[PDB]
Amino acid sequence: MKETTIVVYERPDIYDPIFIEGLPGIGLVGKLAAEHLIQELKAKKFAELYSPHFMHQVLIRKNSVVELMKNEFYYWKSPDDEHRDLIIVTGDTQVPPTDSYGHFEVAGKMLDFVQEFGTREIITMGGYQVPEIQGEPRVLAAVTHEDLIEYYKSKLEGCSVEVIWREDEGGAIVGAAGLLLGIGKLRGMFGISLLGESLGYIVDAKAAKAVLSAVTKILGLEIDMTALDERAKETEEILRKVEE
Amino acid sequence: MKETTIVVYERPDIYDPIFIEGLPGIGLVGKLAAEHLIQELKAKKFAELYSPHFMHQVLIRKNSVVELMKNEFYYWKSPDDEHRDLIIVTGDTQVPPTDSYGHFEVAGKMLDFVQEFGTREIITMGGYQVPEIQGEPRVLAAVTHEDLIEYYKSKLEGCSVEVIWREDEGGAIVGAAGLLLGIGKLRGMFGISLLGESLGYIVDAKAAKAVLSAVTKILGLEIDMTALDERAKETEEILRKVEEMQRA
Amino acid sequence: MKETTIVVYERPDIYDPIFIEGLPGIGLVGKLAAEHLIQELKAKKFAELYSPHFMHQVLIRKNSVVELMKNEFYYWKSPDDEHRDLIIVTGDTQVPPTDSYGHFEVAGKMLDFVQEFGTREIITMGGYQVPEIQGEPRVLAAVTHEDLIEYYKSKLEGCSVEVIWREDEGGAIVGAAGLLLGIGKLRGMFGISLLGESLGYIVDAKAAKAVLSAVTKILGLEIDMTALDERAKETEEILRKVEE
Amino acid sequence: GKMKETTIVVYERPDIYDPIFIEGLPGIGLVGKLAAEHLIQELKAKKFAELYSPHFMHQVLIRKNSVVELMKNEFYYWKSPDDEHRDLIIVTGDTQVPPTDSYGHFEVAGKMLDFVQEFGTREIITMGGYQVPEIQGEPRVLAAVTHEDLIEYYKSKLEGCSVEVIWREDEGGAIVGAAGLLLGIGKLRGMFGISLLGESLGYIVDAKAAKAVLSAVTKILGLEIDMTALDERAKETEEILRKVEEMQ
Ligand SMILES: [Au+]
Ligand SMILES: [Au+]
Ligand SMILES: [Au+]
Ligand SMILES: [Au+]
Ligand SMILES: [Au+]
Ligand SMILES: [Au+]
Ligand SMILES: [Au+]
Ligand SMILES: [Au+]
Ligand SMILES: [Au+]
Ligand SMILES: [Au+]
Ligand SMILES: [Au+]
Ligand SMILES: [Au+]
Ligand SMILES: [Au+]
Ligand SMILES: [Au+]
Ligand SMILES: [Au+]
Ligand SMILES: [Au+]
Ligand SMILES: [Au+]
Ligand SMILES: [Au+]
């Protein structure tokens, strides 16, 4: 483990898949979204990523087992000509905020891996932190190439969630949700970032549903959001009582 | 020394040893435990580790001698077919909390070295930070593979110390007590972490006793714990004599 | 992205240019000077630098596009034998304060690249933080070689801007504005540092004009400074009203 | 002038034999650096090489005459005019690697040792400071060595010395930075030598403790060096202290 390493269990017959990322970040939006999507498509884990730039610890898993912090790749093989093969990543962590080089190298490895499957296109998901939400959560969209605005807009027409095409020039997207797109763009890849508005300090199941709604709209997939509905239901009532 | 270096004095006549880790950590628990085990077994020193990821200083040793910070490997050859040979590592320090990469590199070099002797199995010892202790220190256990819970449970049947099989999902073991097992598991190695409840800012001889009772019990060894008892008693006295000094 | 990298779009027909640097720094002085110089000369972009030592984020550009933080090289081809060709570097950022090694790597890569065009001479622009400025901001000068004092002093003869030859021995110039000269010097390159006195916590157009007047005087160019004058006046009005 | 790593720019390969490597880089009280600089001056030691490092702070310094220059270390040699005193290599400079980059300290110290070994260097003397809360008498110099057998050796070079040298006993104490690492890394390569640290308050430029340390050094070397420029500096700073504490 002298560098970031990917352990491969299975080499699935997917072709030109879309790489979807939902690693930990603001309100765990991306992580929830990605975990939900994996569950509903019954995606199969085929690989895990370990990095010596991750925090130097193991985690307690189920049944008293220890394990390094990792990220995991899942695939989904479309049964149609009408839908894309997917690779979804999610995981325990990102590189700590104090090692920028490590983010570049982890993202670099993630990209090298998905490209072996002919991956060209990336969707990242995460949250955008706001002091107060004033209604339904908006989803903020940004792309790697201008011509993709019109492309993702057409695939989004008829969607519940309000997607806002960001115009906050000089704003930043920190960590994998940005770097996979910024580094991917240098090597001929392309895609879109979708960040849901969120208070950020809580697990945000509601904002995760909105993001996943935009993403599944793009993909032309329909999936059950109830699990996320009730999580939002629960945590809302918990917050009531905490502020009393 | 562009990287972590191990200086090896001899190749000991050992095989399939268990690798035991007691580096500095919470309450100096793992360290006291390992040093006591070194001493009672008359384990022999055979290698030392230096690292450019350790703090950039020398320590004053006995006799006005300076030396880089280091870890030390000791071995014990069993006199019989019913006890495993041991490699035991301890030392001055671990890599500082700000250099995660260095922890992986030091742990990885320790694992490469110990596998040269056929090591498969690892036991790590250390502390689990707790706001207060209610009587007898408990020992928390976690393993690298599920099947090993009853393996080690069997070995531990009848032990005096209470051993809790950890259920704190998403809790963390930081540094070598954790990385040796986490990285070891990627290489097909296996083992168990045993961490003792400790206040943490004290040299905790008594929690060290409890961890080392659990470990020697798994090993089939009986080791005299006297010197640890005596250190726990001495530090107990001095602690409460500080709890009276705080009338200032 | 294993290392700091430069992407070359064009190799212009320039030779022995002067390398001018204006990266972000105190007051954004160097950066505003460089951008204004680029705009007024209509200099042309020809290369971009990316680094895994830069902060691990992408930025939002215009029209909802994401990109890695980067630096950009611009050229100006002199139309006559009495002015020098120029390479001007500017960009989003420098390496963060916590990674010294990265500053050296990025500075060394810039110098490798400009040396391909026969660059020996460097002018760095930036700011010098002061607790107050009464009067016009002064520009502090320092050079790589003692014999260059007279050299740039003659070229500065006539200038409105007051240029002080620094004597604060043991003072420091931090980041590219210092490293490009210090590293340059080891390769047989040479040049001068110009730092405008600035309060430092505001975008300092007035001090940018002052540094750029000293630089264009040295280059023998006459540049319209109006856009900077106007920006300076807008910000002084703001500051006066904000103190109220 | 690639700065991918620490690099030494060599001006001359001095005709020197088995020199003693003397280090006096910045640190506590600037004790080692003043001592080195005054030794260089009094001895007319000649500058023969310069060290630059991408692990130094990312800045240039303003020198005399409005000149910028990277931060650097400089190597000076003294050719002994006779077989009764050793040739010397003396290092000093603007700075050491920052406290946050332990790896960088090992790398820099590493390159220094590689360099001096090209000239046959075996023996190292490092000079610096040891922070105290007050000084009661004349400053003492605290000594420690790479090998036990060297205590007898340096102790018999020091008999009749006007400064008092304490063979330190603070087992577990640390020497941080090049003063420690040159000896610590050196002894891994078979080199050897001594640490001399002068008692100092640290926040002040301490010419007096520098004289103490340089007296012990020159003694060990068999050299008589005029200490007056240090005397006068110590005089100046002791009357500036007084008057700065009149106002506070
Ligand atoms: Au790496
Ligand atoms: Au990342
Ligand atoms: Au995020
Ligand atoms: Au939708
Ligand atoms: Au495209
Ligand atoms: Au390393
Ligand atoms: Au470690
Ligand atoms: Au521990
Ligand atoms: Au037991
Ligand atoms: Au690098
Ligand atoms: Au600046
Ligand atoms: Au820089
Ligand atoms: Au002018
Ligand atoms: Au290095
Ligand atoms: Au020192
Ligand atoms: Au000489
Ligand atoms: Au050092
Ligand atoms: Au003496």
Numbering used by the authors:
A (entry chain B), C (entry chain A): 14 to 257
B (entry chain C): 14 to 261
D (entry chain D): 12 to 259
Passage from the reporting paper:
We discovered that the archaeal PAC1-PAC2 homolog PbaB functions as an ATP-independent proteasome activator. We revealed that binding of PbaB to the 20S proteasome depended on its C-terminal HbYX motif. Moreover, we revealed that PbaB activates the proteasome irrespective of the presence of ATP. Analytical ultracentrifugation also confirmed that PbaB forms a stable homotetramer in solution.
Using the Au3+-bound crystal belonging to space group C2221 with four molecules per asymmetric unit, the atomic coordinates were determined by the single-wavelength anomalous dispersion (SAD) method. The crystal structure of PbaB exhibited a tetrameric structure with a remarkably large (1227 Å2) surface area buried through quaternary structure formation. Each PbaB protomer has a single domain comprised of a central mixed β-sheet (β1–β3–β6–β7–β2–β8–β12–β9–β10) flanked by four α-helices (α1, α3, α5, and α6) on one side and one β-strand (β11) and two α-helices (α2 and α4) on the other side, thereby making an overall three-layered αβα fold. Extended β-hairpin (β4–β5) is involved in tetramerization by forming a three-stranded anti-parallel β-sheet with β11 from the adjoining molecule. In the tetramer structure, the C-terminal α-helices (α6) are located peripheral to the core domain and extend in the same direction, yielding a tentacle-like structure. The α6 helices showed poor electron densities with high crystallographic B values (45–100 Å2), suggesting that the C-terminal segments had flexible properties. Intriguingly, PbaB accelerated proteasomal degradation of LFP and α-synuclein by about 3- and 2.5-fold, respectively, whereas the mutated PbaB that lacked the C-terminal HbYX motif (Gly-Tyr-Leu) did not accelerate proteasomal degradation. Truncation of the eight residues of the C-terminus significantly compromised chaperone activity, and deletion of the α6 helix markedly impaired the suppression of aggregation of citrate synthase. These findings indicated that the tentacle-like C-terminal segments of the PbaB tetramer are critically involved in capturing unfolded proteins. Based on the electron tomography and biochemical data, we hypothesize that a subset of C-terminal segments function as gate openers to activate the 20S proteasome, and the remaining unanchored C-terminal segments are involved in capturing proteasomal substrates.
